[PDB]
Design an enzyme around this catalytic site. Structure first.
Site, PDB file in Angstrom:
ATOM      1  N   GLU A  43      51.903 -65.065  39.604  1.00  0.00           N
ATOM      2  CA  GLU A  43      51.066 -64.747  38.324  1.00  0.00           C
ATOM      3  C   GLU A  43      51.150 -63.093  37.901  1.00  0.00           C
ATOM      4  O   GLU A  43      51.142 -62.807  36.912  1.00  0.00           O
ATOM      5  CB  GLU A  43      49.613 -65.039  38.601  1.00  0.00           C
ATOM      6  CG  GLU A  43      49.394 -66.521  38.887  1.00  0.00           C
ATOM      7  CD  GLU A  43      48.039 -66.932  38.803  1.00  0.00           C
ATOM      8  OE1 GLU A  43      47.306 -66.796  37.748  1.00  0.00           O
ATOM      9  OE2 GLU A  43      47.496 -67.548  40.001  1.00  0.00           O
ATOM     10  N   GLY A  98      61.628 -46.396  56.704  1.00  0.00           N
ATOM     11  CA  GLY A  98      61.343 -45.204  56.771  1.00  0.00           C
ATOM     12  C   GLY A  98      60.236 -44.997  57.418  1.00  0.00           C
ATOM     13  O   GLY A  98      59.363 -45.609  57.808  1.00  0.00           O
ATOM     14  N   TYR A 101      48.121 -38.049  57.171  1.00  0.00           N
ATOM     15  CA  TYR A 101      48.565 -39.173  56.724  1.00  0.00           C
ATOM     16  C   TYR A 101      47.877 -40.562  57.250  1.00  0.00           C
ATOM     17  O   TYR A 101      47.920 -41.288  56.650  1.00  0.00           O
ATOM     18  CB  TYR A 101      49.986 -39.275  56.884  1.00  0.00           C
ATOM     19  CG  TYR A 101      50.906 -38.402  56.313  1.00  0.00           C
ATOM     20  CD1 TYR A 101      50.451 -37.565  55.176  1.00  0.00           C
ATOM     21  CD2 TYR A 101      52.437 -38.121  56.678  1.00  0.00           C
ATOM     22  CE1 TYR A 101      51.245 -36.771  54.475  1.00  0.00           C
ATOM     23  CE2 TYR A 101      53.144 -37.451  55.895  1.00  0.00           C
ATOM     24  CZ  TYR A 101      52.701 -36.671  54.845  1.00  0.00           C
ATOM     25  OH  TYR A 101      53.489 -35.701  54.283  1.00  0.00           O
ATOM     26  N   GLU A 130      66.176 -43.749  62.713  1.00  0.00           N
ATOM     27  CA  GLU A 130      65.910 -42.906  63.883  1.00  0.00           C
ATOM     28  C   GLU A 130      64.527 -43.634  64.604  1.00  0.00           C
ATOM     29  O   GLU A 130      63.836 -44.038  64.196  1.00  0.00           O
ATOM     30  CB  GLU A 130      65.548 -41.465  63.428  1.00  0.00           C
ATOM     31  CG  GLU A 130      64.126 -41.225  62.668  1.00  0.00           C
ATOM     32  CD  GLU A 130      63.164 -40.521  64.000  1.00  0.00           C
ATOM     33  OE1 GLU A 130      63.577 -40.426  64.953  1.00  0.00           O
ATOM     34  OE2 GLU A 130      62.099 -40.237  63.397  1.00  0.00           O
ATOM     35  N   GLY A 190      64.528 -44.443  53.011  1.00  0.00           N
ATOM     36  CA  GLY A 190      63.715 -45.029  52.063  1.00  0.00           C
ATOM     37  C   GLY A 190      64.355 -45.215  50.787  1.00  0.00           C
ATOM     38  O   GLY A 190      64.089 -46.540  50.168  1.00  0.00           O
ATOM     39  N   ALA A 238      69.393 -40.267  58.146  1.00  0.00           N
ATOM     40  CA  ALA A 238      70.208 -40.130  57.027  1.00  0.00           C
ATOM     41  C   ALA A 238      70.156 -38.698  56.472  1.00  0.00           C
ATOM     42  O   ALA A 238      70.871 -38.317  55.641  1.00  0.00           O
ATOM     43  CB  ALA A 238      69.883 -41.081  55.931  1.00  0.00           C
TER      44      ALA A 238
HETATM   45  N1  GTP Z   1      51.348 -41.847  52.338  1.00  0.00           N
HETATM   46  C1  GTP Z   1      52.049 -41.486  53.332  1.00  0.00           C
HETATM   47  N2  GTP Z   1      53.329 -40.957  52.818  1.00  0.00           N
HETATM   48  C2  GTP Z   1      54.231 -40.352  53.841  1.00  0.00           C
HETATM   49  C3  GTP Z   1      53.897 -40.738  55.155  1.00  0.00           C
HETATM   50  N3  GTP Z   1      55.012 -40.291  55.999  1.00  0.00           N
HETATM   51  C4  GTP Z   1      56.171 -39.675  55.141  1.00  0.00           C
HETATM   52  N4  GTP Z   1      55.493 -39.920  53.909  1.00  0.00           N
HETATM   53  C5  GTP Z   1      56.085 -39.570  52.749  1.00  0.00           C
HETATM   54  O1  GTP Z   1      57.601 -39.903  52.568  1.00  0.00           O
HETATM   55  C6  GTP Z   1      58.361 -38.830  51.941  1.00  0.00           C
HETATM   56  C7  GTP Z   1      59.715 -38.426  52.389  1.00  0.00           C
HETATM   57  O2  GTP Z   1      60.393 -39.720  52.793  1.00  0.00           O
HETATM   58  P1  GTP Z   1      60.514 -39.574  54.488  1.00  0.00           P
HETATM   59  O3  GTP Z   1      59.378 -39.480  55.164  1.00  0.00           O
HETATM   60  O4  GTP Z   1      61.784 -38.486  54.742  1.00  0.00           O
HETATM   61  O5  GTP Z   1      61.143 -41.163  54.895  1.00  0.00           O
HETATM   62  P2  GTP Z   1      62.619 -41.567  55.423  1.00  0.00           P
HETATM   63  O6  GTP Z   1      63.157 -42.706  54.370  1.00  0.00           O
HETATM   64  O7  GTP Z   1      62.838 -42.396  56.772  1.00  0.00           O
HETATM   65  O8  GTP Z   1      63.577 -40.346  55.519  1.00  0.00           O
HETATM   66  P3  GTP Z   1      64.808 -40.074  56.419  1.00  0.00           P
HETATM   67  O9  GTP Z   1      64.331 -39.366  57.547  1.00  0.00           O
HETATM   68  O10 GTP Z   1      66.113 -39.577  56.046  1.00  0.00           O
HETATM   69  O11 GTP Z   1      65.041 -41.663  56.923  1.00  0.00           O
HETATM   70  C8  GTP Z   1      57.459 -37.475  51.715  1.00  0.00           C
HETATM   71  O12 GTP Z   1      57.084 -37.085  50.284  1.00  0.00           O
HETATM   72  C9  GTP Z   1      56.172 -37.941  52.428  1.00  0.00           C
HETATM   73  O13 GTP Z   1      55.023 -37.534  51.577  1.00  0.00           O
HETATM   74  C10 GTP Z   1      52.902 -41.507  55.575  1.00  0.00           C
HETATM   75  O14 GTP Z   1      52.448 -41.841  56.735  1.00  0.00           O
HETATM   76  N5  GTP Z   1      51.996 -41.792  54.600  1.00  0.00           N
HETATM   77 MG    MG Z   2      64.065 -42.568  58.326  1.00  0.00          MG
END
Ligand code: GTP
Ligand code: MG
Lengths: 56, 430
Positions: B245, B10, B215, B62, B137, B90
């Protein structure tokens, strides 16, 4: 004069004491939590046992 | 030597990963092109050249996030095969990322991870990253773990996930995906780590001095913890800790594995002018609820076994005095059947700083992994939010239309309820 005594009750302008501004200022304690915070639905809320085998 | 494989899922997983690899290449002394101007074998492989290659796989449904690496400066470091991108994401739908679109690419990825494990003679575990709210994810991550469980079996699969925040939310359907994923995670994962964005925002503004983060700053803090976790396998130390461990010491039962994270000292370094940051100072800073990377206060719950990782100038004499002091603290609880309660490790190499950095080049630091019953607070919130939507069936039609059957919604809801009482029974003592 008893009528006059009844007319002047012993408050002597200790009336209308609480004003609109003061009732705004006074501390208000926390109310009971809303029903929305309670919502875990019943049938899962009622579940009895667990999957961890801790007992012998 | 001994090898660890990294899989990134993701937007979160991929763009956390490039933060992790910019750290390691700078740490080992490898230029972004793979040339040089040791422990390379644990993370990299050597080719018929002076060139190296990471042991990593980037996966997303994507192309936007991965293509940033493809046109970036680091494009020459990665093998073109390692970067896997789908056609259409997705759409934050677990069913779409699990059944319909997930199966379109699952077997393509599994060949590439398996092929990388052939080059890993001393493979000892995998590292997998998630963001629970995302469709890829949670959905594709569940499908990946289920297949990986039967592929490798008795190898330690460690995970590093971002728990949805208590109040900060970016997806409305977010509670649905986390609970369905929690079912697949719990049976197959060996051990998985929780962090959440809301705590990482608060720490990065309070401890580190930044008015407005992105981020990018958060992703660099996560890399330090993974760097300290893997430092035992790479550089010398007076007390080494292997991946296996962590699996045995931390988790008392199968279903109670989920620990939390902490790190100290995290300081904007002008503040580091004033203080020497001894071993006792950094040890005390670990246990304050403000420094937890998960926004749950341990004072509501109790502690089971904890793992401590020291880096740099720390000496074994000073460690014993510090942990003895933290046992005297009556703001910290331990369950009765864990009198030992600790696992300690010491490594000599101090942390590595980065250009455009955020942290200090301090000489010593400490990292923590702790398992606590305070995590039961987070499950109650997520479960409560799930029941509000599900009572009126607020978003089921999207999931069912994409291959999901409705009966999975309550069954995944039942197991979390069992987990909720799993934590309550363990929290008791006799
Ligand atoms: N710590 C951190 N969290 C992130 C970052 N980018 C996204 N998130 C977290 O990711 C969460 C959501 O998941 P998505 O960003 O949509 O990831 P995904 O699984 O690719 O979702 P899809 O677009 O459907 O594929 C959010 O709550 C964000 O806070 C990042 O660069 N750093
Ligand atoms: Mg994705």
């Amino acid at each position: 004069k008893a009528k006059a005594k009844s007319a002047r009750r012993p408050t002597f302008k200790k009336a209308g004491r609480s004003t609109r501004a003061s009732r705004g200022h006074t501390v208000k304690p926390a109310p009971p939590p809303s029903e929305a915070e309670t919502f875990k639905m019943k049938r899962f809320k009622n579940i009895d046992h667990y999957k961890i085998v801790d007992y012998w | 030597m001994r090898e660890v494989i990294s899989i990134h899922v993701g937007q979160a997983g991929v763009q956390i990963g490039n933060g992790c690899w910019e750290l390691y290449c700078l740490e080992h002394g490898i230029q972004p092109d793979g040339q040089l101007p040791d422990a390379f074998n644990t993370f990299f492989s050597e080719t018929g050249a002076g060139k190296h290659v990471p042991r990593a796989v980037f996966v997303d449904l994507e192309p936007t996030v991965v293509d940033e690496v493809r046109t970036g400066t680091y494009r020459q470091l990665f093998h073109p095969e390692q970067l896997i991108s789908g056609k259409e994401d997705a759409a934050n739908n677990y069913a779409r990322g699990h059944y319909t679109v997930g199966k379109e690419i699952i077997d393509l990825t599994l060949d590439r991870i398996r092929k990388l494990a052939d080059q890993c003679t001393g493979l000892q575990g995998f590292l997998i990253f998630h963001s629970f709210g995302g469709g890829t994810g949670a959905g594709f991550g569940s499908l990946l773990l289920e297949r990986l469980s039967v592929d490798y079996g008795k190898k330690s699969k460690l995970e590093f996930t971002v728990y949805p925040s208590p109040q900060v939310s970016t997806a409305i359907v977010e509670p649905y995906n986390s609970i369905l994923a929690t079912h697949s995670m719990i049976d197959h994962s060996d051990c998985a780590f929780m962090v959440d964005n809301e705590a990482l925002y608060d720490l990065c503004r309070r401890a580190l001095d930044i008015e407005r983060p992105t981020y990018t700053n958060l992703n660099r803090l996560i890399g330090q913890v993974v760097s300290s976790l893997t430092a035992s396998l790479r550089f010398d130390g007076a007390l080494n800790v292997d991946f296996t461990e962590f699996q045995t010491n931390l988790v008392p039962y199968a279903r109670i594995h989920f620990p939390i994270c902490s790190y100290a000292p995290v300081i904007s370094a002008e503040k580091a002018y004033h203080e020497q940051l001894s071993v006792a100072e950094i040890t005390n800073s670990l246990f304050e609820p403000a420094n937890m990377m998960v926004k749950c206060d341990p004072r509501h719950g109790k502690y089971m076994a904890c793992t401590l990782l020291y880096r740099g100038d720390v000496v074994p004499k000073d460690v014993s005095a510090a942990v003895a002091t933290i046992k005297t603290k009556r703001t910290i609880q331990f369950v009765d059947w864990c009198p030992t309660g600790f696992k300690m490790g010491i490594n000599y190499q101090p942390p590595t700083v980065v250009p455009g950095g955020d942290l200090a080049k301090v000489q010593r630091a400490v990292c923590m992994l702790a398992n606590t019953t305070a995590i039961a607070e987070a499950w109650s919130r997520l479960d409560h939010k799930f029941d509000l939507m599900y009572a009126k069936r607020a978003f089921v039609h999207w999931y069912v239309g994409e291959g999901m059957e409705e009966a999975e919604f309550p069954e995944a809801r039942e197991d979390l309820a069992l987990l909720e009482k799993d934590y309550d029974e363990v929290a008791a003592e006799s």
